[PDB]
């Protein structure tokens, strides 16, 4: 069996205490990163699944084990795909991480529990976000079905169907699966192969990398004369990387505190690539790879590198402090428990603008009709156009309003 890395990024959405990590575990086997130094940087974890098919019935086709002994046929499984999971939490406080996750995602998985109430605002918000950020491949999954009645589940399904009609997602498949009992995952696997294809990707496009997580490889007990370099957990959308290249983290860093800053973006040479489980020479875009570079282990510690752009040497993108946005607003607010009408944008107000993966606070200067000018506090970079989600404050915490695009 060949040790091929991740091909396409699949993300999972839900709610707090509903069950997402458990579902992930059921799907794959290797436990999630979340659940001080290691793993702790963002809200998303790290998981990997296997797609191997046995074609020699009905729904039973794909499996989780490398060896086929369970269904009947003793023959070895055929290699189809290998996928990486991006598990994003569905909490009312933390959403920036989710947004960041969304930017890299190519496939989405919705989770709704049976026993709880049918209309949930957070789930709706998530769906809206998915719709916004160039995602159409959505599979609806029912979580807790075993604790529900014979007709109640059907009713719930009907309600769901009624709800999802006017949205961009038209032909979304619905699967009921148990997380604690471990059943019906084969159908899900089959669907993964059926409904979702891999988009065309080539070597010709300029390298662009997005870092979500940060890692320091330091072990207690062992002497200091045996050290390991700083690892940046970064996912790639476009551009193939190989071992032996120069990488730079774009936005900038503060090194001296009197004296104006002039220091260039953080340069680092690649030491070792961590994909799936074992090290590989080539990096195929469409997965999260722990890129171990010559960067400090102290820098890759905690909340320092959350959603930052990474480029290869011989390419020049632009850095902006003032940004030109083309926005579109929604009718009523999504996320609030009660629904409130969206007000027109007022000059000079603190609003959270999420350009791809960056979590930045911006203030409005001029409003016309569709075009808006924003002043940023923390530095941000622009490459092409980018997919932007906008968030405002009305009551206590952040609420989503609509979508935006950079006009440059």
């Amino acid at each position: 069996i060949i040790n091929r890395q991740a091909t396409i990024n699949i993300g999972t959405i839900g709610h707090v205490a509903h069950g997402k990590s458990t579902v992930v575990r059921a799907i794959s086997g290797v436990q999630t990163v979340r659940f001080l130094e290691r793993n702790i940087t963002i809200k998303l974890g790290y998981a990997n699944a296997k797609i191997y098919k046995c074609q020699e019935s009905f729904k039973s086709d794909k499996e989780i084990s490398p060896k086929c002994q369970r269904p009947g046929c003793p023959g070895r499984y055929k290699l189809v795909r290998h996928v990486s999971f991006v598990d994003c939490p569905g909490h009312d406080i933390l959403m920036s991480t989710m947004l960041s996750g969304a930017a890299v995602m190519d496939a989405a998985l919705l989770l709704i529990a049976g026993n709880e109430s049918c209309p949930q605002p957070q789930t709706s918000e998530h769906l809206a976000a998915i719709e916004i950020m160039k995602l159409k491949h959505v599979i609806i999954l029912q979580n807790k079905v075993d604790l529900m009645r014979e007709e109640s589940a059907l009713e719930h399904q009907k309600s769901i169907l009624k709800f999802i009609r006017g949205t961009i997602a038209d032909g979304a498949p619905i699967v009921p699966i148990s997380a604690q009992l471990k059943y019906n995952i084969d159908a899900v696997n089959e669907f993964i192969v059926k409904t979702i294809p891999v988009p065309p990707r080539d070597f010709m496009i300029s390298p662009r990398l997005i870092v979500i997580r940060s890692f320091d490889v330091n072990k207690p007990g062992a002497e200091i004369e045996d050290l390991k370099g700083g690892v940046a957990g970064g996912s790639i959308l476009n551009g193939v990387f190989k071992l032996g290249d120069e990488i730079e983290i774009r936005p900038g860093i503060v090194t001296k505190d009197k004296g104006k800053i002039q220091c260039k973006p953080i340069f680092s040479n690649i030491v070792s690539l961590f994909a799936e489980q074992n090290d590989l020479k080539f990096a195929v875009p469409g997965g999260l790879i722990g890129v171990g570079t010559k960067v400090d282990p102290t820098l890759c510690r905690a909340d320092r590198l959350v959603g930052q752009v990474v480029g290869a040497k011989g390419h020049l993108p632009n850095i902006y402090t003032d940004i030109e946005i083309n926005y579109f607003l929604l009718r009523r607010l999504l996320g609030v428990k009660k629904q409130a009408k969206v007000r027109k944008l007022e000059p000079n107000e603190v609003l959270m603008v999420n350009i791809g993966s960056t979590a930045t606070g911006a203030r409005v200067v001029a409003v016309k009709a569709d075009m808006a000018r924003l002043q940023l506090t923390s530095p941000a970079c622009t490459e092409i156009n980018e997919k932007i989600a906008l968030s405002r404050r009305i009551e206590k915490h952040w609420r989503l309003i609509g979508w935006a695009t950079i006009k440059k």
């Binding site: 009905f58 079905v145 169907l161 699967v175």
Partner: peptide
Amino acid sequence: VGLPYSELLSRFFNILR
């Protein structure tokens, strides 16, 4: 389209502890 879901549901109902 909501047609092969029913069969799956039935199967789930059948296979339980």
